[PDB]
């Protein structure tokens, strides 16, 4: 009765949203960028192989200084790496070994940590004691921590396997804002460059654009066929790319509210675990399950290059803030740095 | 060419390398296990010694068994955390015929998952006493839930447990064959289901886990020496 008419109203609203997106789809991004020059063969070589993790790496997050990077591997350790010299700056033992995410605070004073413990653990790096101490444990999620990103030293937005995202106040330990609306496990998170918004890819084949302050889902982006494991904003904040299990990467405009370009190839069968843009956004790098990373021309959907140096599943990428290098973490317990 | 502080940072990195090596040697001494099964399976009563971690030691070999109860029913992403465990402990209520196909589908999804393609499964067909009482009562029939059981017979070249009715033996062999056929349908022998029948009062399950993990590491060694 009421549920059937609500489902019909949802169907009509989805139909008119699709018609609005079709009316705004005058010409594709491939037709616009057909006349510009291709990037050629982007050939990055492994500069640093960061060794010392002893189980599979799930997540790595560069520092904003573009030198330090934290990496999360399920040996119960968060290693911070002086990527220029391959020096391990900190080894952070974790109370739960099953880490699935790590963040690096933009100030550099904190790292985050989360996974199957359903807890985003905040670790202080600038303690007077000289060790890395647990600053705060954020224990409100009823599903696994899949991604977390600091906005500053006091606020962190965490995606989770309980189909929600949460904005936290680290000093109080409480959820300032809960972001609900996903129906699958939210696997990835990407903050906007101004940190006003963030996108979240989930296991419902949908990416949702959230507002951090007012707390609602502003836009919902469909087009993928399987679980979105990976999400990354375009550097202007107007677009974002996703990576999914359907062996495709897709680029979505916020303002056009639809897909712009699909990054896929015929022999690519495996899903995407990690996506990242270059500093200009021209190169979309994507980490795959077939142990490689494919560099995509983000404007032309062309396979620019292959970062093939990992002997197991690539689980995380990270491009530096100055764009100098890409670090690829993988399940072979290694972090390779490419440029 | 390094500075005084750059050299001392390398020394701190070397100490961190040494501590990580020591922690890795400590972590490789224990065998990580993933405890899986439905809510009626009796997972927590298998070994008598959000994540429920059970540590037990058989013949001075440490075992770390992980039970994940802190997640919701969608498991396709967090099950990839356990690619590198020695074994997956899959516990099945053998008496519950209605959820037996659900357990078979769960085992088939575990068995054919790409990141679980290399992990052997220690299958515990739990509550075989309740299975025996359900078979001897004759009220609940397996043929209603599994029509191929009616044309199933106990193999002639088989060894029943002593003191067992051959109806209970045929039921046990059929449920074990239902899991073993899924196990041998794919995987090419790189991972092996080890099926055991288990009571609620059975105290041999730690020894069974020890013997099966012994066979798992034995298979890893034999594949390392090209001995299959």
């Amino acid at each position, epitope marked *: 009765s009421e549920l059937d008419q609500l489902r019909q109203e949802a169907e009509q609203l989805k139909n008119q949203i699709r018609d609005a997106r079709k009316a705004c789809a005058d010409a594709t991004l491939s037709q616009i960028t057909n006349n510009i020059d291709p990037v050629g063969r982007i050939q990055m070589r492994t500069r640093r192989t960061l060794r010392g993790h002893l189980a599979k790496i799930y997540a790595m997050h560069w520092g904003t200084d573009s030198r330090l990077l934290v990496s999360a591997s399920q040996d119960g350790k968060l290693i911070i790496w002086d990527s220029y010299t391959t020096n391990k*700056v900190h080894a952070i033992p974790l109370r739960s070994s099953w880490v699935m995410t790590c963040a690096y605070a933009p100030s550099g004073n904190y790292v985050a940590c989360g996974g199957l413990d359903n807890i985003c653990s905040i670790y202080n790096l*600038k303690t*007077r*004691e000289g*060790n890395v101490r647990v600053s705060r444990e954020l224990a409100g999620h009823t599903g696994y921590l899949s991604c977390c990103r600091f906005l500053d030293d006091n606020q962190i937005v965490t995606s989770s396997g309980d189909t929600t995202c949460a904005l936290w106040d680290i000093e109080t330990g409480q959820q300032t804002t809960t972001f609900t609306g996903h129906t699958g496990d939210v696997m990835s998170l990407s903050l906007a460059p101004d940190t006003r918004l963030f996108v979240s890819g989930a296991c419902d084949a949908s990416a949702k654009l959230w507002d951090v302050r007012e707390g609602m889902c502003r836009q919902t982006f469909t087009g993928h066929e399987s679980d979105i494991n990976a999400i990354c904003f375009f550097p202007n904040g107007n677009a974002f790319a996703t990576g999914s299990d359907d062996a495709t990467c897709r680029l979505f405009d916020l303002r056009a509210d639809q897909e712009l370009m699909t990054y896929s190839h015929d022999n690519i069968i495996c899903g995407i675990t990690s996506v990242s843009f270059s500093k200009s956004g021209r190169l979309l790098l994507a980490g795959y399950d077939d142990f490689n990373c494919n560099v995509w021309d983000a404007l032309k959907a062309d396979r620019a290059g292959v970062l093939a140096g990992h002997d197991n599943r690539v689980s995380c990428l990270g491009v530096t803030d100055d764009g100098m290098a890409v670090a690829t973490g993988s399940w072979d317990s290694f972090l390779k740095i490419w440029n | 060419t390094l500075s*005084a502080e750059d050299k*001392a940072a390398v*020394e701190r*990195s070397k*100490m961190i390398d040494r501590n990580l090596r020591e922690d890795g040697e400590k972590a490789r001494r224990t065998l990580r296990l993933l405890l899986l099964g439905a809510d009626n399976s009796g997972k927590s009563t298998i070994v008598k010694q959000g994540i429920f971690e059970t540590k037990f030691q058989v013949d001075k070999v440490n075992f770390h068994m992980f039970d994940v109860g802190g997640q919701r029913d969608e498991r396709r992403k967090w099950i990839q955390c356990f690619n590198d465990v020695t074994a997956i402990i899959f516990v099945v209520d053998s008496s519950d015929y209605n959820r037996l196909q659900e357990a078979l589908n769960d085992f088939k999804s575990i068995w054919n998952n790409r990141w679980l393609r290399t992990i052997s499964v220690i299958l515990f067909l739990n509550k075989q006493d309740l299975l025996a009482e359900k078979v001897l009562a004759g009220k609940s029939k397996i043929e209603d839930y599994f029509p191929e059981f009616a044309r199933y017979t106990t193999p002639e070249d088989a060894t029943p447990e002593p003191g067992e009715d051959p109806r209970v033996t045929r039921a046990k062999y059929f449920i074990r064959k239902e899991f073993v056929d899924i196990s041998t349908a794919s995987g090419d022998g790189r991972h092996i289901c080890y099926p055991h029948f288990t009571c609620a009062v059975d105290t041999e399950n730690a020894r069974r886990i020890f013997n099966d993990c012994k066979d798992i590491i034995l298979q890893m060694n034999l594949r390392e020496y090209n001995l299959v």
Partner: single-chain antibody
Amino acid sequence: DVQLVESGGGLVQPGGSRKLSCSASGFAFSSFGMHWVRQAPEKGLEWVAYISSGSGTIYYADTVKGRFTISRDDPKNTLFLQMTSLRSEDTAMYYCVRSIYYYGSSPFDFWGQGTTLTVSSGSDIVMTQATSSVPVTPGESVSISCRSSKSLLHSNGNTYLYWFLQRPGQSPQLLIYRMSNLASGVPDRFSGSGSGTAFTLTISRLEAEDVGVYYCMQHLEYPLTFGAGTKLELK
């Protein structure tokens, strides 16, 4: 609270032996490389010895090389300075200094209160301070200049000059590490700039608690050498 307490100092006859113990509390002692820095009553700070974290690398000053032995016991959280064949030049206040070394670390950040040892009676980077006493008033900007015989700028981009403030009757504290970075607990008024050889410590909006002797120290290469020291006096 991070605390280093020195003990074992006393009146020793020349040529004798004396043991200095530095008790560490309130911090992870085994992760910090440790230093001994002595200060004669008629001189400034002088680096004595350095034991690393984990006791892997040990450096001594050439004045105390062979005579002195530095050691630590990490489970007991203590730092030891075995001194043998003591001379009258060793009459000084020996400071226990912790120093951790990673990227962006703050070495020489905390110093012990010191113990008083009394004895009766070339290739080193020369660190020069052009002035030794600057008459200052509160509310006035003061620049403390320091110079180095060797360029402290390294090929990695870091310029290893360290600024210290020793208030009268108090242990030295770290103000500026690696020529530009503010140490923890130091206000934003303390600023440091340098060109690799010439260095300065820009101090603005002076207060009465900022007085004391200001030392510049290089950490480019062992042996670590301090400046002569610039004392600030009110009015």
